[PDB]
Design a protein around this nucleic acid. Structure first.
Ligand SMILES: Nc1nc2c(ncn2[C@H]2C[C@H](O)[C@@H](COP(=O)(O)O)O2)c(=O)[nH]1
Ligand SMILES: [Ca+2]
Ligand SMILES: [Ca+2]
Ligand SMILES: [Ca+2]
Length: 341
DNA sequence: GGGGGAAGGATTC
DNA sequence: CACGGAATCCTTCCCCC
């Protein structure tokens, strides 16, 4: 099996650059303004000009502005980026019908048929890179290997605007030398749990008693890491299906007042329903981000579809359940609809 | 003992 | 100071054969 992974470079910001080319070369910072106070919020993404100075996704807009006061700061326009993304995905869809659209800027291609051996794969990558740059003016990084995980890792090592192949020889080299934190799906939480078990490299997972691994990071994650170390990971390429649609907003002030939170919750509901399409959900969850950035939620699954009236009514009950069972003041509030009919 | 949901939380990107 | 949005996974609880 030959997997070719495509990852769009600093996507949101690059799109802004495409829509306003005079931005090229300047530090571009795409932000999610929360509205709590001037420049409150965080960086969704930044181009490399900004990233080389420390301005990257996750940092407060206020911090970024202290580092780069003269950079271009733009509000995130999700809808625009999503339409551009869809156009790029269709284009790849013609390089294979075996495609996995992992996110707004990542897709995996099973080019096991369209090619044989890594020479042609690499050639096909450049074809894809040049095609996308040509038709959309978007640069992307291509990663190629035997499975999804190493194809992605390949891209992680080649970005930005690169292409790379990890063949059956390097895979083994990485299995013992690749820092395990750099393995997809291994975040900071898991990375630390594995460090405490003496696991710093993928191969170390084979020196531990499985039942201990399972105990520490869960069975799924355990089998995942073990399979990769045995050089046996081989999940198939297939675009998952949207299983949930939702919206969460930040209130001006943290609150615990119902009549004060509602308008936010209802706005969340209104946007969620618009996003729903003609999809009808049978489950609804109210999600609240507490004052100490803790996430709490209460939901309910109905034996039938939820109309917007029912959603408005149930959400209030769920919200009251949250306020009732959690003392902290509330900072962000939203809803999520799932179990579509 | 264990299938099958549902619920609330934990994690990742 | 720290936004969002969604998928997996986990663990707990529950009904019940
Ligand atoms: N809103 C938001 N989006 C992010 C963050 N990190 C990455 N992304 C998005 C940018 C796009 C996609 C690229 O991969 O991931 C983040 O911290 N906040
Ligand atoms: Ca990516
Ligand atoms: Ca990217
Ligand atoms: Ca990591």
């Amino acid at each position: 099996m030959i997997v070719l992974f495509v990852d769009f470079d600093y996507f949101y910001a690059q799109v802004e650059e495409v829509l306003n080319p005079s931005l090229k070369g300047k530090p571009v910072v795409v932000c999610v303004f929360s509205g709590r106070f001037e420049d409150s919020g965080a960086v969704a993404t930044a181009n490399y000009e900004a990233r080389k100075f420390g301005v990257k996704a996750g940092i407060p807009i206020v911090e970024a502005k202290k580092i780069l006061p003269n950079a271009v700061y733009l509000p995130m326009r999700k809808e625009v980026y999503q339409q551009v993304s869809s156009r790029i995905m269709n284009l790849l869809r013609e390089y294979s019908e075996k495609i996995e659209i992992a996110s707004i800027d990542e897709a995996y291609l099973d080019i096991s048929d369209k090619v044989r051996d890594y020479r042609e794969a690499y050639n096909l990558g450049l074809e894809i890179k040049n095609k996308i740059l040509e038709k959309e003016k978007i640069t992307v990084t291509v990663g190629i290997s035997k499975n999804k995980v190493f194809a992605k890792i390949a891209a992680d090592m080649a970005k930005p605007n690169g292409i790379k192949v990890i063949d059956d020889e390097e895979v083994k080299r990485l299995i013992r030398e690749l820092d395990i934190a750099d393995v997809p799906g291994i975040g900071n939480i898991t990375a630390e749990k594995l460090k405490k078990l003496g696991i710093n490299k993928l191969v170390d997972t084979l020196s531990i008693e499985f039942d201990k691994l399972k105990g520490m990071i869960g069975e799924a994650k355990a089998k995942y890491l073990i399979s990769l170390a045995r050089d046996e990971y081989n999940e198939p390429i297939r675009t998952r299906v949207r299983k949930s649609i939702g919206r969460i907003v930040t209130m001006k002030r943290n609150s615990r007042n119902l009549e004060e939170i509602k308008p936010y919750l209802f706005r969340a509901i209104e946007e969620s329903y618009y996003k729903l399409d003609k999809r009808i959900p049978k489950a609804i969850h109210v999600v609240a981000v507490t004052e100490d950035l803790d996430i709490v939620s209460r939901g309910r699954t109905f034996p039938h579809g939820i109309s917007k009236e029912t959603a408005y009514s149930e959400s209030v009950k769920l919200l009251q359940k949250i306020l009732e069972e959690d003392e902290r003041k509330i900072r962000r509030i939203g809803v999520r609809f799932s179990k579509f009919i």
